Amino acid sequence: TKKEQKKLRRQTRREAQKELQEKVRLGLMPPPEPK
RNA sequence: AGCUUUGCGCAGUGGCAGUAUCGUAGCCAAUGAGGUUUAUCCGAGGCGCGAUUUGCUAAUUGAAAACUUCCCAAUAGCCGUGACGACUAGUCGGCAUUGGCAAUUUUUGACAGUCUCGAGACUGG
């Protein structure tokens, strides 16, 4: 259902933001371009 | 092969964000939520409770705003004077420091403005 699409997308995106900030936390790269 | 539809995912431009976006593990819900319009019609979530990550930078207070200071002593132009020295009371060279260096020949400013085709003129009432 569409609410489950929103929840699955938002939790995949939350772990995606979490693992990008995780790879910033390890210090492999400076953070991406802010705009 | 190209066009294209629908759903989903990714990224990007822009817009919106407390009558917005959600969670709900409590209950109810297409075996029908919720309906004053059109009701022998419409058809999706509803009621409560509960929310509103991360990095960077600025500014303020504060003694201190969190990534491995202050203080004393000494060293880093010339005219005179004192010695030392040199050359004939005088002259010269270097050194030293116990006064001075804005009144025509110099270092405390006759300068400033104006106009004309490298060169001159005007004014400072």
CSV table of C-alpha atoms (C1' of nucleotides) in Angstrom, one decimal:
chain,number,residue,atom,x,y,z
A,1,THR,CA,0.0,0.0,0.0
A,2,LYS,CA,1.0,3.6,-0.6
A,3,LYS,CA,1.6,4.3,3.1
A,4,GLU,CA,3.9,1.3,3.1
A,5,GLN,CA,5.7,2.6,0.1
A,6,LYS,CA,6.3,5.9,1.9
A,7,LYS,CA,7.5,4.1,5.0
A,8,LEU,CA,9.8,1.7,3.1
A,9,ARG,CA,11.2,4.6,1.0
A,10,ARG,CA,11.7,6.8,4.1
A,11,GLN,CA,13.5,4.1,6.1
A,12,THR,CA,15.7,3.1,3.2
A,13,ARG,CA,16.5,6.8,2.8
A,14,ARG,CA,17.1,7.2,6.6
A,15,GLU,CA,19.6,4.3,6.5
A,16,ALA,CA,21.1,5.9,3.3
A,17,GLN,CA,21.6,9.3,5.0
A,18,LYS,CA,22.8,7.4,8.1
A,19,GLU,CA,25.4,5.4,6.1
A,20,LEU,CA,26.6,8.5,4.2
A,21,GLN,CA,27.0,10.4,7.5
A,22,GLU,CA,28.7,7.2,8.7
A,23,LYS,CA,31.2,7.3,5.9
A,24,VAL,CA,31.7,11.0,6.8
A,25,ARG,CA,32.2,9.9,10.4
A,26,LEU,CA,34.9,7.5,9.4
A,27,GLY,CA,36.6,10.4,7.6
A,28,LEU,CA,37.0,8.9,4.1
A,29,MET,CA,35.8,12.1,2.4
A,30,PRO,CA,34.8,15.7,3.3
A,31,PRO,CA,30.9,16.1,3.3
A,32,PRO,CA,29.1,16.7,0.0
A,33,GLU,CA,28.2,20.0,-1.6
A,34,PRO,CA,25.8,22.1,0.5
A,35,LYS,CA,23.2,24.0,-1.4
B,1,A,C1',13.5,1.2,-34.1
B,2,G,C1',11.2,5.4,-32.1
B,3,C,C1',7.1,7.5,-29.4
B,4,U,C1',4.2,6.9,-25.0
B,5,U,C1',1.2,5.3,-20.2
B,6,U,C1',1.1,3.6,-15.1
B,7,G,C1',3.5,2.3,-10.5
B,8,C,C1',8.1,2.4,-7.9
B,9,G,C1',13.4,3.8,-7.0
B,10,C,C1',17.5,7.4,-7.7
B,11,A,C1',19.3,12.3,-8.5
B,12,G,C1',18.4,17.6,-10.0
B,13,U,C1',15.7,22.7,-10.6
B,14,G,C1',11.9,25.0,-8.0
B,15,G,C1',8.0,25.3,-4.3
B,16,C,C1',5.9,24.2,0.5
B,17,A,C1',6.6,22.9,5.7
B,18,G,C1',2.8,23.5,13.0
B,19,U,C1',-5.1,23.6,9.9
B,20,A,C1',2.3,21.1,7.7
B,21,U,C1',4.9,16.2,7.8
B,22,C,C1',4.6,11.7,10.4
B,23,G,C1',4.8,7.5,14.3
B,24,U,C1',1.0,4.7,16.6
B,25,A,C1',3.1,-0.7,19.6
B,26,G,C1',-4.2,1.4,21.7
B,27,C,C1',-8.8,0.6,19.1
B,28,C,C1',-11.8,0.7,14.6
B,29,A,C1',-11.6,0.1,9.0
B,30,A,C1',-13.5,-2.1,2.1
B,31,U,C1',-16.9,-8.6,6.2
B,32,G,C1',-16.9,-0.6,4.9
B,33,A,C1',-13.8,4.5,7.5
B,34,G,C1',-16.6,8.9,7.0
B,35,G,C1',-20.7,11.3,4.8
B,36,U,C1',-25.5,18.1,6.1
B,37,U,C1',-24.6,18.3,-1.6
B,38,U,C1',-27.2,14.3,-5.5
B,39,A,C1',-28.8,9.4,-0.3
B,40,U,C1',-31.6,2.6,-3.5
B,41,C,C1',-26.0,8.0,-3.6
B,42,C,C1',-20.8,8.6,-2.5
B,43,G,C1',-16.0,5.0,-1.0
B,44,A,C1',-10.6,5.8,2.4
B,45,G,C1',-8.3,5.7,6.0
B,46,G,C1',-10.5,7.5,10.9
B,47,C,C1',-10.6,8.5,16.6
B,48,G,C1',-7.4,9.3,20.4
B,49,C,C1',-2.2,9.5,22.4
B,50,G,C1',2.7,11.2,21.0
B,51,A,C1',6.2,13.7,18.2
B,52,U,C1',8.9,17.1,15.2
B,53,U,C1',18.4,13.4,12.8
B,54,U,C1',23.2,15.2,11.0
B,55,G,C1',27.5,18.6,9.6
B,56,C,C1',29.4,23.7,9.1
B,57,U,C1',29.7,28.8,10.6
B,58,A,C1',28.7,33.3,13.3
B,59,A,C1',27.8,35.9,17.9
B,60,U,C1',27.4,36.4,23.2
B,61,U,C1',28.4,35.8,28.3
B,62,G,C1',32.1,33.7,31.1
B,63,A,C1',38.8,34.2,34.0
B,64,A,C1',38.7,29.8,31.3
B,65,A,C1',33.7,27.9,25.7
B,66,A,C1',38.4,22.7,25.8
B,67,C,C1',42.5,19.1,19.9
B,68,U,C1',48.2,17.7,23.2
B,69,U,C1',51.5,33.3,29.4
B,70,C,C1',53.8,37.8,31.6
B,71,C,C1',57.9,40.7,33.4
B,72,C,C1',63.4,42.5,34.3
B,73,A,C1',68.7,43.7,32.6
B,74,A,C1',71.8,44.3,28.4
B,75,U,C1',73.2,43.9,22.8
B,76,A,C1',71.6,44.2,17.8
B,77,G,C1',74.9,62.3,11.5
B,78,C,C1',77.2,67.0,12.8
B,79,C,C1',79.0,70.7,16.2
B,80,G,C1',82.0,70.6,21.7
B,81,U,C1',84.5,67.8,25.2
B,82,G,C1',88.4,63.4,27.0
B,83,A,C1',92.2,60.4,25.8
B,84,C,C1',95.0,57.6,22.3
B,85,G,C1',97.6,58.2,18.0
B,86,A,C1',99.9,60.7,13.8
B,87,C,C1',102.0,65.2,11.5
B,88,U,C1',104.2,70.3,12.1
B,89,A,C1',100.3,76.2,20.3
B,90,G,C1',98.3,74.5,15.3
B,91,U,C1',96.5,70.4,11.9
B,92,C,C1',94.5,65.5,10.8
B,93,G,C1',92.3,60.3,11.5
B,94,G,C1',89.6,56.9,14.4
B,95,C,C1',87.3,55.9,19.1
B,96,A,C1',84.3,57.4,23.3
B,97,U,C1',79.9,60.4,25.4
B,98,U,C1',78.5,63.7,30.8
B,99,G,C1',75.4,70.0,26.3
B,100,G,C1',73.1,71.6,21.6
B,101,C,C1',71.1,70.9,16.5
B,102,A,C1',62.9,74.9,13.1
B,103,A,C1',65.6,82.4,12.0
B,104,U,C1',69.1,84.1,5.0
B,105,U,C1',74.2,79.2,2.4
B,106,U,C1',71.5,73.6,2.9
B,107,U,C1',68.0,68.8,7.2
B,108,U,C1',62.2,71.4,9.5
B,109,G,C1',60.1,73.5,3.2
B,110,A,C1',58.3,80.0,-1.5
B,111,C,C1',54.7,77.0,-1.9
B,112,A,C1',49.8,76.3,-3.8
B,113,G,C1',46.1,77.3,-7.3
B,114,U,C1',45.0,79.0,-12.6
B,115,C,C1',45.5,79.4,-18.1
B,116,U,C1',48.0,78.6,-23.4
B,117,C,C1',50.6,76.0,-27.7
B,118,G,C1',58.6,69.7,-24.4
B,119,A,C1',57.8,75.8,-23.4
B,120,G,C1',55.8,80.2,-21.1
B,121,A,C1',52.0,83.7,-18.8
B,122,C,C1',48.4,85.0,-14.4
B,123,U,C1',47.0,85.2,-9.1
B,124,G,C1',47.7,84.7,-3.8
B,125,G,C1',43.2,91.9,-3.4
